[PDB]
Amino acid sequence: SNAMKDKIIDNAITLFSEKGYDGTTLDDIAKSVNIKKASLYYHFDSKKSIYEQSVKCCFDYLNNIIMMNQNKSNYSIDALYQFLFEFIFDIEERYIRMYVQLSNTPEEFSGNIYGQIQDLNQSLSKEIAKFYDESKIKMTKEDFQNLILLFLESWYLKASFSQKFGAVEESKSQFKDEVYSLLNIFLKK
Amino acid sequence: SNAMKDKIIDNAITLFSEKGYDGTTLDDIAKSVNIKKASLYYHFDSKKSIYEQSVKCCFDYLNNIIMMNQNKSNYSIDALYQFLFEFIFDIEERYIRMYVQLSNTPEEFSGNIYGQIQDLNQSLSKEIAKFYDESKIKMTKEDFQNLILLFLESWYLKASFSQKFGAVEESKSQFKDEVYSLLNIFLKK
Ligand SMILES: [Cl-]
Ligand SMILES: [Cl-]
Ligand SMILES: [Cl-]
């Protein structure tokens, strides 16, 4: 136990991350905690409400990776890799897989979800900015932020794909080569 | 009928790109072309065959962007900006969304799909390399290919999200200006 509401939402994040909104059924969710479909209604009013709550949990998790980066980082150029690794290859891969699946959200209520996406981007940009050192980096702090953000954005899909298709070690190796190359691009010699 | 089979696939790409495999029904597909559902089986033996063939068509389309560029491009710096423009603006949204939807394919049908994902990346990288010019790009060829690849591969998820959350054309314009701003950093030209 002890909280059926949380059990449904934990199971739902998994189902949604694997099949997306349109492909995940209330029956799937109910089966996954061993209750009848109608018993979901003890905890939620709709499928859309189960999804919204699962999406909030997903953003809570991702935002927390960022917030926690300051207990783990001296913000040197060398610490930047560790940060980008932890965000793309987090112990629990369903969260990034879920973020990619947001692209299947009911266009109905994408406004709140869109806000969460912008908020997460703001927070990620702010964390990247702490690694900026004008004397070491041959571009503005804004261009450095945009570059690293796009680097991470290309990897969300690439990491989801490699997880889904069981090529994760090969993917981490490519990422390591690409971050090396990224540092080479922006570091003054 | 080869023409009907083609029309079924063309429509199924659209439907799949919207709701993915599990969220798309054979009924949906038949209605799209206004045929009885039994008529689907004249050309396919299952929903699985329609999807496989739709995914292949989608990669043919995406790979054809490169073939077209080979046919025309002088590979100048001007041609590099135009290729980036064409990738962002001229790739029809449904093919990008189909590509992102490859994320919720049932495991039982992984097929050759990851191979197609990796080959497209390989092919794009080879075409990008043709624009490298030591006299104009203040980069190693390695870093130039990686930079251009991150522009193109970050576009997939942005474009897929733009459909749900705001505006496809506004996103193209904003992303194009962003990518141009970053590329400009590396041009001696
Ligand atoms: Cl209950
Ligand atoms: Cl990348
Ligand atoms: Cl424009």
Nearest CB among B100, B104, B154 relative to A18 is that of B104
Separation of first and last alpha carbons in chain B: 53
Which pair of structure tokens corresponds to residue A57?
């949990």
Domain boundary assignment for chain B: 1-189
Place of tokens 């949906």: B28
User: Measured between CA atoms, how close is A143 to chain B, in angstroms?
Assistant: 7
CA distance linking residue A86 with residue B155, whole number of Å:
22
Place of tokens 């733009």: B162
DSSP, collapsed to helix, strand or coil, labels residue B174 as: helix
Rounded to the nearest angstrom, the distance between the alpha carbon of A113 and the centre of ligand 1 is 27
The size of chain A, in residues, is 189
* Experimental method, per PDB record: X-ray
> Do the beta carbons of residue A132 and residue A186 sit within 8 Å?
no
CA distance linking residue B160 with residue B142, whole number of Å:
28
Which pair of structure tokens corresponds to residue A96?
């990034």
- The string over A60-85, giving b where at least 16 C-beta atoms fall within 10 Å of a residue's C-beta and e elsewhere, is ebbeebbeebeeebebeeeebeebbe
Strand partners, B187: B137
- Class of A1-189 per CATH? mainly alpha
DSSP states along A1-65: ---HHHHHHHHHHHHHHHHHHHH--HHHHHHTTT--GGGGGGT-S-HHHHHHHHHHHHHHHHHHH
Pick the residue from chain A with its C-alpha nearest to B181: A143
CA A95 to chain centroid: 5
Which pair of structure tokens corresponds to residue A64?
């927390």
Q: CA gyration radius for chain B?
A: 19
- Determine which of B124, B157, B160, B186 to mutate to test the interface with A (most A C-beta atoms within 10 Å): B157
Say yes or no for a CB contact (<8 Å) between A153 and B158. yes
- Resolution in angstroms comes to 1.9
Nearest CB among A21, A100, A182 relative to B157 is that of A100
Amino acid identity of residue B187, one-letter, is L
> Do the beta carbons of residue A86 and residue A65 sit within 8 Å?
yes
Rounded to the nearest angstrom, the distance between the alpha carbon of A12 and the centre of ligand 1 is 15
What is the SS3 string spanning A124-148?
HHHHHHCCCCCCCECCCHHHHHHHH
